[PDB]
Design a protein around this ligand. Structure first.
Ligand SMILES: OC[C@H]1O[C@@](CO)(O[C@H]2O[C@H](CO)[C@@H](O)[C@H](O)[C@H]2O)[C@@H](O)[C@@H]1O
Ligand SMILES: [Ca+2]
Ligand SMILES: [Ca+2]
Ligand SMILES: [Ca+2]
Length: 501
């Protein structure tokens, strides 16, 4: 087996903390997926960043909701807004507070902002942002693409097309409600489509990607307040992307080719050297011994130091282990009744491994068999006695155990006897012989003894009949005791009346 070197991941509210990191004033509510980036208070800054580089040769997609606040330019003291930034620089870094709207401060980056505070006059040098454009001045929050230069200075993107020009929001933030927000990037066309509360911005971003000097990016979502404020929040929702600059590490059963424990993904910046873990002690605890390392999908791997060096493309290292623990069968001793269909004895087996376990069974009583399909001893035992049953349990790695238990086939069921009706016949007349018919679960001989016979009548053990000529008028109770080989007994009776002619 071989896995992909770069996964296509979806970040959701439950795995968010596995893939992303909050910083500054940001907090997170896992039950709702709500990242609160700032509260409605002065001088706040909060961010969330994705801990793996995104490959822009593949599609990526944020689908969620955003609360931009409840006041904005010309309608309350609202700011600063929320920035969604894609940076060619290192993971974990965020843009600046203020007019930079979380994008200014990052070099050669691009992104999209929702901007509630119109910075009409030129921000100072330290703000790393040009003024907001005239075409969105005069009232209302607006949305826009943003790009930065090599000094980290943000320019709000404007154009002569309504497709991607900076534009006032159709749905203004008046009441702290969450609106639908979507950033969709198509890795085939390089077109980024941003949608906020039904309003769309669309642009081919091939040029900004080329200007950034790379095809793999660090994603941040950052909001701030200064003297102007707002509750600013992003709700997950989901973020889908394909990894760049990762190494996959798998822990694989050499016999089956299956993952023994979950694989691990290490992330870094391009050229970052990262130590990976072969998890030997965890595999040992699971009954596995180290076998080898295959690093053919990670040419940067150094087995002495256990390091890889991240590249744009994903790498993969596989550690192989061998299952060195035999399976266990637990089966207690059994007592079953001869000539009855037994309820199955399930040969309950457990094993530490990833493959198939095969049981082979010997020493079964006659009539019993091992059913593979149900892993059970089934059948009807035909013979009294005790057997030692041996079960040899073999896993796919050829670890073997053998277990024995006893099956005692017993007879505790008494014979059954066809009923004989009460009889009547004339004194001194020979009778039609009365047949005594028995059956038993042992399938073996039932022996009968008979008492209480009218005088002149005889029981014959050879063919189990009563016959003869009765010589006394009167009434008899004939008593038959039927015994199997095990000593189980049945008493059957009937009345015999000897009459006058
Ligand atoms: O309140 C506006 C007033 O405050 C100043 C600081 O003196 O700027 C702060 O407020 C702005 C809006 O929240 C931010 O853009 C800025 O980063 C923050 O320092 C004044 O510059 C501004 O006029
Ligand atoms: Ca602004
Ligand atoms: Ca095993
Ligand atoms: Ca019996």
């Amino acid at each position: 087996t071989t896995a992909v070197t770069a996964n296509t991941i979806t970040v959701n509210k439950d795995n968010l903390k596995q893939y992303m990191t909050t910083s500054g004033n940001a907090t997170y509510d896992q039950s709702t997926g709500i990242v609160t980036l700032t509260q409605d208070a002065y001088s706040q800054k909060g961010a969330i960043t994705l801990g793996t580089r995104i490959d822009s040769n593949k599609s990526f997609h944020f689908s969620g909701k955003v609360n931009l606040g409840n006041k904005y330019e010309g309608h309350g003291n609202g700011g600063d807004g929320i920035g969604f930034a894609f940076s060619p620089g290192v993971l974990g870094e965020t843009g600046l507070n203020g007019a930079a709207v979380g994008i200014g401060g990052l070099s050669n980056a691009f992104g999209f902002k929702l901007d509630t505070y119109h910075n009409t006059s030129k921000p100072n040098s330290a703000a790393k942002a040009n003024a907001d454009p005239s075409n969105v001045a005069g009232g209302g929050a607006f949305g826009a693409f943003v790009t930065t230069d090599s000094y980290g200075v943000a320019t709000t993107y404007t154009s002569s097309s309504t497709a991607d020009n900076a534009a006032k929001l159709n749905v203004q933030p008046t009441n702290n409600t969450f609106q639908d927000f979507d950033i969709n990037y198509n890795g085939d066309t390089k077109v980024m489509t941003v949608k906020y509360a039904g309003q769309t911005w669309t642009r081919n971003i091939s040029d900004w990607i080329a200007k950034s000097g790379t095809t793999n990016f660090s994603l941040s979502m950052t909001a701030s307040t200064g003297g102007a404020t707002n509750l600013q929040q992003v709700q997950f929702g989901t973020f889908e992307y394909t990894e760049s600059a990762v190494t996959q590490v798998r822990y694989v059963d050499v016999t089956t080719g299956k993952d023994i424990i979950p694989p691990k993904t290490y992330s870094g910046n391009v050229d970052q050297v990262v130590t990976i873990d072969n998890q030997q002690s965890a595999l040992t605890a699971k009954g596995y011994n180290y076998t080898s390392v295959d690093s053919s999908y990670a040419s940067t791997y150094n087995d002495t130091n256990k390091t890889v060096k991240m590249t744009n493309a994903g790498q993969s290292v596989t550690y192989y282990f061998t299952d060195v623990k035999a399976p266990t069968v637990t089966v207690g001793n059994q007592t079953i009744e001869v000539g009855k269909t037994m309820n199955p004895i399930v040969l309950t087996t457990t094993d530490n491994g990833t493959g198939t376990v095969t049981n082979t069974v010997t020493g079964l009583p006659s009539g019993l068999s091992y059913d593979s399909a149900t892993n059970s001893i089934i059948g009807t035992p035909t013979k009294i006695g005790q057997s030692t049953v041996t079960v040899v349990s073999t896993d796919q790695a050829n670890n073997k155990s053998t277990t024995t238990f006893t099956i005692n086939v017993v007879d505790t069921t008494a014979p059954t006897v066809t009923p004989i009706g009460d009889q009547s016949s004339e004194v001194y007349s020979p009778i039609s012989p009365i047949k005594i018919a028995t059956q038993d679960n042992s399938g073996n001989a039932v022996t009968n003894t008979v008492t209480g016979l009218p005088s002149g009548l005889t029981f014959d053990s050879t063919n189990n009949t009563i016959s003869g000529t009765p010589t006394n008028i009167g009434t008899s109770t004939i008593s038959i005791v039927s015994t199997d080989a095990s000593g189980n007994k049945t008493t059957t009776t009937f009345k015999y009346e000897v009459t006058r002619n």
